Amino acid sequence: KILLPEPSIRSVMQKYLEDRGEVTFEKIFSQKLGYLLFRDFCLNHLEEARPLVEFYEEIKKYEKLETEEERVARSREIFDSYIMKELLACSHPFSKSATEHVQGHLGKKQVPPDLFQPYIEEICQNLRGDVFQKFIESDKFTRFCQWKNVELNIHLTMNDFSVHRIIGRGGFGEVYGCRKADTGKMYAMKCLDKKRIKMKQGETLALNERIMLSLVSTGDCPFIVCMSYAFHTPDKLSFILDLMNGGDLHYHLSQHGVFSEADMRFYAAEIILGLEHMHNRFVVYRDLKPANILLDEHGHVRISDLGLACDFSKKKPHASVGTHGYMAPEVLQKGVAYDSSADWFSLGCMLFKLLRGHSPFRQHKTKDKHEIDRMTLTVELPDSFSPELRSLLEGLLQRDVNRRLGCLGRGAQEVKESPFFRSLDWQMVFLQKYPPPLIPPRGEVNAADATKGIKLLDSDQELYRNFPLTISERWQQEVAETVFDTINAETDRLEARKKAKNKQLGDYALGKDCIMHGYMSKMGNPFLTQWQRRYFYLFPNRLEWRGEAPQSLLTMEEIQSVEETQIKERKCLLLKIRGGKQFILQCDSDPELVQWKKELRDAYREAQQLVQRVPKMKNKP
Amino acid sequence: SELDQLRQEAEQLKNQIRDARKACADATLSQITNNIDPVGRIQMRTRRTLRGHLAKIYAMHWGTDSRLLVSASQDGKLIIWDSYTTNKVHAIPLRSSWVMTCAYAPSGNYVACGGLDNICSIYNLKTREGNVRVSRELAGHTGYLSCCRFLDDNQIVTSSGDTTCALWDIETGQQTTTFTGHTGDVMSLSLAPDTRLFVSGACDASAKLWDVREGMCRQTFTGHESDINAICFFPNGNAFATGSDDATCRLFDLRADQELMTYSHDNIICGITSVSFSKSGRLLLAGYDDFNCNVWDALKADRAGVLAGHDNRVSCLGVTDDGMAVATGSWDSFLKIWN
Amino acid sequence: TASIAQARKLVEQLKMEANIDRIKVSKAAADLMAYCEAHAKEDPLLTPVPASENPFREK
Ligand SMILES: O=C(NCc1ccccn1)c1cc([C@@H]2CCNC[C@H]2COc2ccc3[nH]ncc3c2)ccc1F
């Protein structure tokens, strides 16, 4: 389960974030959990900002209205409730350009999904600063510090997941269906064996897949397999990815046979939106083929395996990378620079394979690599294809890059306007509202299928030392949709019994010059595993702790250095004292250790330099 | 040049002052007292050990009742002790950790303290419900507060690292009088018995006599080769002693306007942190950086006794007004009462 | 410093210190000894008092 720290964590947490400029309204409001707490603060704990956030929320609900008949009804309700009636009481704190824009469209009866967009800018300008500072002063920002402490202290192991049946097998590892224990969110675990990576010399692809997954996993794309976490064991590399347990199209292309033009239109539409999302983040996939298109439980598809995808934001690629039968002519030609145009040509080869059962260039059932190459370098479309489909493939399978569809300077939008997709509402494609042509049956049974005697070295593990990663937007969304409300209530009643019991029994930090205060464990006799958990107070000239008022301390002039060491596979703080003595401290989280190390160092440097210039306090021969 | 003539004239006045003093040095205090009997062995034992502070003690001050006792410590606290019972009357957490000095008002109604916060804080000891709250913060110095002494409940005098001293009206917080003249950090001050004059010792190796009600420097005393860390009046207001980093104490007579005696021994090399006279002025007690307090014969300049009961620097001492005991504060967080 | 006013202030200060009435050291030394003699009886640290008048000797 998830355990929130005590509200006393605010002291260390608030300085940790403030050193990183993370206490900005722009930084906390744009986070999923920060918004929920800031909104919970404005609604219930403030009569002044309550209309401002309810106005903000009615706009965000208006933007998600799909049809025009719903937006004509909603835009008038918002205007009559948050514009007109506020202007009637003169308590409408918005500019004249804001009222003239909304009222201008309404009398004109124009209701685009971004009608109230100018108000979004001004609602934030009124929440930022005055209301945002009163929010930091409240318990809601304390709760944000408690949650942010959990997020920043994430260290995933295999035991954090319940691993189930295999949903995919590849050349370097397997993919399992798993469930994250603390929240219950179902995921997939792509588990790569470091050993099988060294033998096949694929360390570049493994590391490249992580940075490529990191570039795309923000924004929640429904058509790419995105990453929530990444971690490694001494033997394995683990990606935590969207659960896609319906197999790939390579397997379904065999069990079902070729697809009709209409059934192909579904997979084509969802892949395009995936390629658009990838191209908007300057990533070329290069490996588009039915084996890399996975299906979920309902039949919707996502692009997966980003190992061969590379960034082209700076230098365009030129190497021959891809699967023979799908690589563009300028891809095979080594030394020829190319960009996202490869995926549009790859789309043509893949869409033809779903229609005719083979790549357009793998003819008369050939297995020869060099033959599929030359038949692509320098276009028989059968009599069965319709003229609109014929136009799409002829546009996507143009060998000249300057004449290929989707390469003419507008990206995927050109492909969306192809007469082959004239019947589709692309917003309905994004919302996954079209019925999939193939609903997979439960039980994998080999639906996503593609020894060794070498040992791992210390040099092999150093390549994987920057592998752990956590996408913050992913974790907060995972939390918000599961336990965020339940944990907030469970930890609210505990902080209430604490005040219900302390008021009858009986703060040491207020009214002085205390820098920071919080919990820490100091080491007594290490042979007894004697760790003593005490609440510490850091002053400019001493460090006090208690368990009962503080009965001992440590002056900043005794401290000679602050060095971070490891004790029994755990990070601890080692203070060397002037009397040849050592002081050992342990925290509950990584950010606490980072902050105590920084502040204790800052305090003994400033204090010792200050004591030096005072004749009464300094040491004399 | 006028600036050159003013420098030339100031040198002649220094020589005129020097020759006038030598015209009075007909005999010495050592010759004068050569006939009186020695004090003998001053054997003082520890009677109380005040345990409470968690770090270095910097300053203490006796109350006029010869029983209550306030001290300032590195732990950012003022403790008001009952020396008869060792019970702590008040433990005052301070708003600033860098406290360096403390004073007990003659009436016992207020205590004061200050340090690197450049502020003298007056604490009220009469509030019934609230337990010892700040009544005034005296701001004005541009350097650290090194010493402060009440004249009564409405006036207090302070010394500062900004090389000045000041007299304050506590009711209004005004710095009514400024005492400029020192060229180094003022380390200590001592009020005269009639509270009409006071002496100050600074890091310029000089002591100065000030007129409280007129704000002028009357006399300047030189002789120490290093900073003067402590100072106190002879019980009759006509002389005073100074402790210095040069490992010596010196006695200065006001009316003869010069040094009378130097208290030093070749064995003693560490500096002096505090000085005080016994009730009759016969004994001069001095605290040292070598963890000891030495009792000096003020008239014959002999070592009368040694107080050795601290494991770190003796930073402050003081004799009760009844002369019944001496308290010593130390860098080992302990105060000890001797008689 | 190059301050003319500061130099005047110092010259005027040294004149205040120069034009004072000083007594011989012999007289100053005798008056101090006469004080110690007159009050050597009232000094508990000098002439030791018994444990009865001592608040710190077993009470
Ligand atoms: O080594 C594999 N690639 C080569 C590679 C990958 C990374 C680094 C270097 N070299 C590999 C391949 C596969 C599959 C086999 C068929 N092509 C599709 C691959 C996708 O597999 C799935 C199945 C279900 C899923 N749900 N969520 C995610 C997910 C992923 C599986 C595991 C692999 F390990």
PDB file of N, CA and C in Angstrom, chain A residues 511-552:
ATOM      1  N   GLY A 511       8.988  30.996  16.241  1.00  0.00           N
ATOM      2  CA  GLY A 511       9.446  32.120  17.031  1.00  0.00           C
ATOM      3  C   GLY A 511      10.945  32.263  17.162  1.00  0.00           C
ATOM      4  N   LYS A 512      11.730  31.480  16.424  1.00  0.00           N
ATOM      5  CA  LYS A 512      13.180  31.554  16.537  1.00  0.00           C
ATOM      6  C   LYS A 512      13.818  31.761  15.168  1.00  0.00           C
ATOM      7  N   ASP A 513      15.024  31.230  14.969  1.00  0.00           N
ATOM      8  CA  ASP A 513      15.701  31.283  13.679  1.00  0.00           C
ATOM      9  C   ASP A 513      15.923  29.886  13.105  1.00  0.00           C
ATOM     10  N   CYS A 514      15.012  28.960  13.396  1.00  0.00           N
ATOM     11  CA  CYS A 514      15.160  27.585  12.934  1.00  0.00           C
ATOM     12  C   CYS A 514      15.125  27.517  11.410  1.00  0.00           C
ATOM     13  N   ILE A 515      16.117  26.838  10.831  1.00  0.00           N
ATOM     14  CA  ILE A 515      16.195  26.708   9.379  1.00  0.00           C
ATOM     15  C   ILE A 515      15.272  25.602   8.886  1.00  0.00           C
ATOM     16  N   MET A 516      15.409  24.408   9.453  1.00  0.00           N
ATOM     17  CA  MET A 516      14.667  23.248   8.993  1.00  0.00           C
ATOM     18  C   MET A 516      14.462  22.310  10.171  1.00  0.00           C
ATOM     19  N   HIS A 517      13.408  21.502  10.095  1.00  0.00           N
ATOM     20  CA  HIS A 517      13.113  20.546  11.151  1.00  0.00           C
ATOM     21  C   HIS A 517      12.367  19.357  10.563  1.00  0.00           C
ATOM     22  N   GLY A 518      12.633  18.180  11.115  1.00  0.00           N
ATOM     23  CA  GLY A 518      11.989  16.971  10.642  1.00  0.00           C
ATOM     24  C   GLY A 518      12.564  15.746  11.321  1.00  0.00           C
ATOM     25  N   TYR A 519      12.068  14.591  10.883  1.00  0.00           N
ATOM     26  CA  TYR A 519      12.488  13.318  11.452  1.00  0.00           C
ATOM     27  C   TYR A 519      13.785  12.833  10.819  1.00  0.00           C
ATOM     28  N   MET A 520      14.585  12.144  11.628  1.00  0.00           N
ATOM     29  CA  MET A 520      15.824  11.518  11.191  1.00  0.00           C
ATOM     30  C   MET A 520      16.193  10.456  12.212  1.00  0.00           C
ATOM     31  N   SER A 521      16.931   9.451  11.758  1.00  0.00           N
ATOM     32  CA  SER A 521      17.382   8.364  12.616  1.00  0.00           C
ATOM     33  C   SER A 521      18.892   8.460  12.771  1.00  0.00           C
ATOM     34  N   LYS A 522      19.351   8.637  14.003  1.00  0.00           N
ATOM     35  CA  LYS A 522      20.776   8.674  14.288  1.00  0.00           C
ATOM     36  C   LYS A 522      21.222   7.318  14.819  1.00  0.00           C
ATOM     37  N   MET A 523      22.472   6.972  14.532  1.00  0.00           N
ATOM     38  CA  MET A 523      23.003   5.665  14.886  1.00  0.00           C
ATOM     39  C   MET A 523      23.625   5.710  16.275  1.00  0.00           C
ATOM     40  N   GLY A 524      23.187   4.800  17.141  1.00  0.00           N
ATOM     41  CA  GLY A 524      23.806   4.633  18.439  1.00  0.00           C
ATOM     42  C   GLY A 524      24.931   3.622  18.367  1.00  0.00           C
ATOM     43  N   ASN A 525      24.769   2.491  19.047  1.00  0.00           N
ATOM     44  CA  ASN A 525      25.743   1.412  18.962  1.00  0.00           C
ATOM     45  C   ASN A 525      25.423   0.560  17.739  1.00  0.00           C
ATOM     46  N   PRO A 526      26.257   0.604  16.695  1.00  0.00           N
ATOM     47  CA  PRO A 526      25.909  -0.101  15.449  1.00  0.00           C
ATOM     48  C   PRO A 526      25.898  -1.613  15.583  1.00  0.00           C
ATOM     49  N   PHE A 527      26.639  -2.179  16.538  1.00  0.00           N
ATOM     50  CA  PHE A 527      26.627  -3.625  16.734  1.00  0.00           C
ATOM     51  C   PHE A 527      25.277  -4.128  17.225  1.00  0.00           C
ATOM     52  N   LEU A 528      24.458  -3.248  17.798  1.00  0.00           N
ATOM     53  CA  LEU A 528      23.114  -3.582  18.243  1.00  0.00           C
ATOM     54  C   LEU A 528      22.051  -3.183  17.227  1.00  0.00           C
ATOM     55  N   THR A 529      22.459  -2.785  16.016  1.00  0.00           N
ATOM     56  CA  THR A 529      21.551  -2.208  15.021  1.00  0.00           C
ATOM     57  C   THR A 529      20.701  -1.112  15.654  1.00  0.00           C
ATOM     58  N   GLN A 530      21.341  -0.306  16.497  1.00  0.00           N
ATOM     59  CA  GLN A 530      20.647   0.657  17.347  1.00  0.00           C
ATOM     60  C   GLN A 530      20.457   1.944  16.558  1.00  0.00           C
ATOM     61  N   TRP A 531      19.304   2.061  15.909  1.00  0.00           N
ATOM     62  CA  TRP A 531      18.903   3.291  15.242  1.00  0.00           C
ATOM     63  C   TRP A 531      17.840   3.980  16.085  1.00  0.00           C
ATOM     64  N   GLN A 532      18.065   5.252  16.392  1.00  0.00           N
ATOM     65  CA  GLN A 532      17.171   6.026  17.241  1.00  0.00           C
ATOM     66  C   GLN A 532      16.477   7.084  16.394  1.00  0.00           C
ATOM     67  N   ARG A 533      15.156   6.983  16.292  1.00  0.00           N
ATOM     68  CA  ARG A 533      14.362   7.908  15.497  1.00  0.00           C
ATOM     69  C   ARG A 533      14.023   9.130  16.341  1.00  0.00           C
ATOM     70  N   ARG A 534      14.531  10.289  15.932  1.00  0.00           N
ATOM     71  CA  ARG A 534      14.354  11.528  16.669  1.00  0.00           C
ATOM     72  C   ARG A 534      13.916  12.633  15.719  1.00  0.00           C
ATOM     73  N   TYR A 535      13.210  13.619  16.262  1.00  0.00           N
ATOM     74  CA  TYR A 535      12.842  14.809  15.507  1.00  0.00           C
ATOM     75  C   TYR A 535      13.944  15.850  15.667  1.00  0.00           C
ATOM     76  N   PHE A 536      14.539  16.265  14.553  1.00  0.00           N
ATOM     77  CA  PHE A 536      15.681  17.166  14.568  1.00  0.00           C
ATOM     78  C   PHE A 536      15.259  18.598  14.266  1.00  0.00           C
ATOM     79  N   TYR A 537      16.005  19.546  14.835  1.00  0.00           N
ATOM     80  CA  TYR A 537      15.833  20.970  14.569  1.00  0.00           C
ATOM     81  C   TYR A 537      17.187  21.544  14.182  1.00  0.00           C
ATOM     82  N   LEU A 538      17.256  22.178  13.016  1.00  0.00           N
ATOM     83  CA  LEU A 538      18.490  22.774  12.524  1.00  0.00           C
ATOM     84  C   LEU A 538      18.432  24.284  12.717  1.00  0.00           C
ATOM     85  N   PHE A 539      19.311  24.797  13.563  1.00  0.00           N
ATOM     86  CA  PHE A 539      19.499  26.219  13.796  1.00  0.00           C
ATOM     87  C   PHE A 539      20.768  26.689  13.103  1.00  0.00           C
ATOM     88  N   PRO A 540      20.970  28.005  12.977  1.00  0.00           N
ATOM     89  CA  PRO A 540      22.188  28.485  12.300  1.00  0.00           C
ATOM     90  C   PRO A 540      23.479  28.104  13.002  1.00  0.00           C
ATOM     91  N   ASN A 541      23.432  27.704  14.276  1.00  0.00           N
ATOM     92  CA  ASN A 541      24.645  27.405  15.026  1.00  0.00           C
ATOM     93  C   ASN A 541      24.633  26.047  15.716  1.00  0.00           C
ATOM     94  N   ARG A 542      23.576  25.255  15.560  1.00  0.00           N
ATOM     95  CA  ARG A 542      23.498  23.973  16.245  1.00  0.00           C
ATOM     96  C   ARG A 542      22.432  23.115  15.582  1.00  0.00           C
ATOM     97  N   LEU A 543      22.503  21.814  15.856  1.00  0.00           N
ATOM     98  CA  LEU A 543      21.508  20.845  15.408  1.00  0.00           C
ATOM     99  C   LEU A 543      20.992  20.104  16.634  1.00  0.00           C
ATOM    100  N   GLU A 544      19.721  20.309  16.963  1.00  0.00           N
ATOM    101  CA  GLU A 544      19.109  19.692  18.129  1.00  0.00           C
ATOM    102  C   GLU A 544      18.178  18.562  17.703  1.00  0.00           C
ATOM    103  N   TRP A 545      18.006  17.590  18.599  1.00  0.00           N
ATOM    104  CA  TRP A 545      17.080  16.488  18.386  1.00  0.00           C
ATOM    105  C   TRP A 545      16.449  16.108  19.717  1.00  0.00           C
ATOM    106  N   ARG A 546      15.279  15.474  19.638  1.00  0.00           N
ATOM    107  CA  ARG A 546      14.493  15.162  20.823  1.00  0.00           C
ATOM    108  C   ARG A 546      13.665  13.910  20.568  1.00  0.00           C
ATOM    109  N   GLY A 547      12.942  13.482  21.600  1.00  0.00           N
ATOM    110  CA  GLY A 547      12.050  12.341  21.504  1.00  0.00           C
ATOM    111  C   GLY A 547      10.892  12.413  22.483  1.00  0.00           C
ATOM    112  N   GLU A 548       8.979  15.396  25.324  1.00  0.00           N
ATOM    113  CA  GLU A 548      10.374  15.428  25.745  1.00  0.00           C
ATOM    114  C   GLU A 548      11.175  16.403  24.881  1.00  0.00           C
ATOM    115  N   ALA A 549      11.703  17.449  25.513  1.00  0.00           N
ATOM    116  CA  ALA A 549      12.427  18.503  24.819  1.00  0.00           C
ATOM    117  C   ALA A 549      13.839  18.048  24.457  1.00  0.00           C
ATOM    118  N   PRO A 550      14.481  18.714  23.494  1.00  0.00           N
ATOM    119  CA  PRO A 550      15.859  18.342  23.134  1.00  0.00           C
ATOM    120  C   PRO A 550      16.803  18.452  24.325  1.00  0.00           C
ATOM    121  N   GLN A 551      17.503  17.353  24.609  1.00  0.00           N
ATOM    122  CA  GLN A 551      18.446  17.281  25.718  1.00  0.00           C
ATOM    123  C   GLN A 551      19.889  17.127  25.252  1.00  0.00           C
ATOM    124  N   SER A 552      20.132  17.183  23.946  1.00  0.00           N
ATOM    125  CA  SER A 552      21.480  17.158  23.396  1.00  0.00           C
ATOM    126  C   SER A 552      21.441  17.815  22.025  1.00  0.00           C
TER     127      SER A 552
END
